[PDB]
Amino acid sequence: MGAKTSKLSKDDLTCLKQSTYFDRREIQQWHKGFLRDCPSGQLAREDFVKIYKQFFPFGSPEDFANHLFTVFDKDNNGFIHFEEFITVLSTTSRGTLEEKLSWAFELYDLNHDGYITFDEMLTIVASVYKMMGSMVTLNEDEATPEMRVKKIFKLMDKNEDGYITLDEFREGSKVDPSIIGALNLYDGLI
Ligand SMILES: [Ca+2]
Ligand SMILES: [Ca+2]
Ligand SMILES: [Ca+2]
């Protein structure tokens, strides 16, 4: 016998494989720094937002930290642990195959009826918009999510059923080169 599979350092790499966008040198730095500020290692919803705020004091990342944190966690404890915290930050940058697509869907389904709803869309789509800006790009451009919203759903639920299931998402998304831009705006930058 030897080491199982539930530790922090080292165990991460083994799992974070195919991604690990934070070589040991990094996660180790925050590890000791995070446990120092919290010997119990527990990032609560409040903390989460606090970090997003300082990052974008000009925006209002409120429902953002909520939606995500809500459709996250694994121990249903109401608190994000170190390994869990970075899991979020990681998926934020870089990805791979449809894996990133499936995850996004679950996040948009504010509820869980295996089906998404226009209500759950505007709410989320609005969170990513009210968060980051758009003038840091190049060509001035703007649009109340109301427009991009009607566009995102119009192409997602191209089957008429009030609600849309993941299956339809991967299809209308993986194909129609357009919904990905917005849908991605939420997931995270490149
Ligand atoms: Ca947790
Ligand atoms: Ca739904
Ligand atoms: Ca549908």
From Swiss-Prot:
Amino-acid positions noted as binding Ca(2+) 2 in the UniProt annotation, renumbered to this chain: 109, 111, 113, 115, 120
Record's subcellular location: Bud membrane
Annotated family: Belongs to the recoverin family.
GO molecular function terms noted in the UniProt entry: calcium ion binding; enzyme activator activity
PROSITE patterns per record: EF_HAND_1, EF_HAND_2
Main location: membrane
Residue intervals of the EF-hand domain: 24-59, 60-95, 96-131, 144-179
Subunit structure and binding partners: Binds PIK1.
Residues engaged in binding Ca(2+) 1: 73, 75, 77, 79, 84
Gene3D superfamilies in the cross-refs: EF-hand (1.10.238.10)
Keyword terms: Calcium, Cell membrane, Lipoprotein, Membrane, Metal-binding, Myristate, Repeat
One cellular-component annotation, GO: cellular bud membrane
Anything else known: Binds 3 calcium ions via the second, third and fourth EF-hand. Present with 7160 molecules/cell in log phase SD medium.
Positions of Ca(2+) 3 binding: 157, 159, 161, 163, 168
Record's function text: Regulator of phosphatidylinositol 4-kinase PIK1.
Stored Pfam families: EF-hand_7, EF-hand_8
PANTHER family assigned: CALCIUM BINDING PROTEINS (PTHR23055), NEUROCALCIN HOMOLOG (PTHR23055:SF178)
InterPro entries: EF-hand-dom_pair, EF_Hand_1_Ca_BS, EF_hand_dom, Recoverin
Membrane topology recorded in Swiss-Prot or TrEMBL: Peripheral membrane protein
Protein name: Calcium-binding protein NCS-1
